[PDB]
Paper text:
TTR is a homotetrameric plasma protein that carries L-thyroxine (T4)8 and vitamin A910.
Because the filling of the cavity with additional hydrophobic chemical groups has been reported to increase TTR stability, we decided to test whether introducing four additional methylene groups by mutating Ala 108 into Ile would result in a denser packing of the T4-binding channel and, accordingly, in an over-stabilized protein variant. The modelled TTR [name] variant was predicted to be more stable than A108V by FoldX, with a ΔΔG of 13.71 kcal.mol−1 relative to TTR WT. The stabilization promoted by the [name] mutation is even more dramatic, since this variant begins to unfold only above 8 M urea and its tetrameric structure seems to be essentially intact even at 9 M of the chaotropic agent. To dissect unambiguously the molecular details accounting for the higher stability of the natural and designed TTR variants, we solved the crystal structures of both TTR A108V and TTR [name] homotetramers at 1.3 and 1.4 Å resolution, respectively. Regarding to the tetrameric assemblies, the major finding on the TTR A108V and TTR [name] structures is a significant reduction of the volume of the ligand-binding hydrophobic cavity and the formation of a few novel interactions, namely between side chains of Val/Ile108 and Leu110 (3.80 Å), between Val/Ile108 and Thr106 (3.95 Å) inside the same monomer, and between Ile108 and Leu17Symm (3.58 Å). In addition to the formation of these novel interactions, it is remarkable the reduction of the hydrophobic cavity that binds T4 and other hydrophobic compounds, which is partially occupied in our TTR variants by the aliphatic side chains of Val108 or Ile108, leading to formation of a much closer AC/BD interface in the tetrameric assembly.
Residue numbers in the entry:
A (entry chain A), B (entry chain B), C (entry chain A), D (entry chain B): 10 to 125
């Protein structure tokens, strides 16, 4: 599983459940092509977005729909979404975990990149 | 000054100087129309992007060129850039300060919103 | 496993391996009594600090020796250590994960608290 | 002003006003000797804790009373407080700004260190 997204709610100290996540990949013509999507589970994780074979080198964008998460809790948050844009697999295949820590007016994003 | 951006370097413990910042407004056809830009000063701040008159309600994107900053320091970074997207002035004009705390494989973006 | 500590290096985008962690509990006389200790594994996690039965209500302090981690990498970091002080189990037993994200001049700490 | 503390509220998007801050210096017997204190202003800042003459080399602890702040807002917090511990002036006198970004179950502390 080479791309995993984990989303945590820093207000409640809990996984952020049912958060929509959309992944895009930059094409040769420079547009953003839809690549995969999903929602976070009860553990705040989203697995199974892609496979080692499909996840070739390229520039990827992960957009996490944090506004709908907060709005469902009654909150009008600052960000429309939490983004992550990155070059993947430049020196060969790696496994990427994207960790997003969410608050209504702040978000932090961290990548843990490992080599199997 | 309705929009200010402050960028800090968590590796060196310093303002992040000469970071390029580009601001866009979402156009009616959902494309991003570039609005303003500048580079952070010696205190890591960027002032004067826009004015109260021009900064009408809408959705804005602030792109911070973090990859160029880390490259200039000789440090391998994860992200292409950091993209803060937010709806402005939804309840009246506000002053926004966006604080970006940078590390090579992690960053956080926080908004401090005050009502003049 | 009711107390778990996970430590990540935000510079390299990796688990922070072999980081010493000391846990203390406030006694009735208000001193800090040593409670458990350990080091993070290859995954940056430290499991097995305590048991559900031993981990009674109280105020706990987790001190993560981040200075030795950075010094071994050649870096003189800002913090002497990363602390976490918290009341545990006030409304009954819970499971606590403490996530520390480390940079030489910044650290973030987040608690994920769940109810089995 | 060799030591300043700035505290921000990630839930409301604002300076964290009237937060108590206590500074200690480690004594020769390893006890913490309280040094100075104050509360953050309307801009979330606390200036004037110490002076260049008094702020000699040593190990300092800054305790930020985050639990009282969250209680005053009616929000359940995780931590008892946030404790930033650092060695000061090891390579000569520096000006330190400690920035604390607060959420109820997460916080980060960053130092901006500049040489006058």
């Amino acid at each position: 599983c080479p791309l995993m997204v984990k989303v945590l709610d820093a207000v409640r100290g809990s996984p952020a459940i049912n958060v929509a996540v959309h992944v895009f990949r930059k094409a040769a013509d420079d547009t953003w092509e839809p690549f995969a999507s999903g929602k976070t589970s009860e553990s705040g994780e989203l697995h199974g977005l892609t496979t080692e074979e499909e996840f070739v080198e390229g520039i990827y964008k992960v957009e996490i729909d944090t506004k709908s998460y907060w709005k469902a809790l009654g909150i009008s948050p600052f960000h429309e979404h939490a983004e992550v844009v990155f070059t993947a697999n430049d020196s060969g295949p790696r496994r990427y975990t994207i960790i997003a820590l969410l608050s209504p007016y702040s978000y932090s994003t961290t990548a843990v990149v490992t080599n199997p």
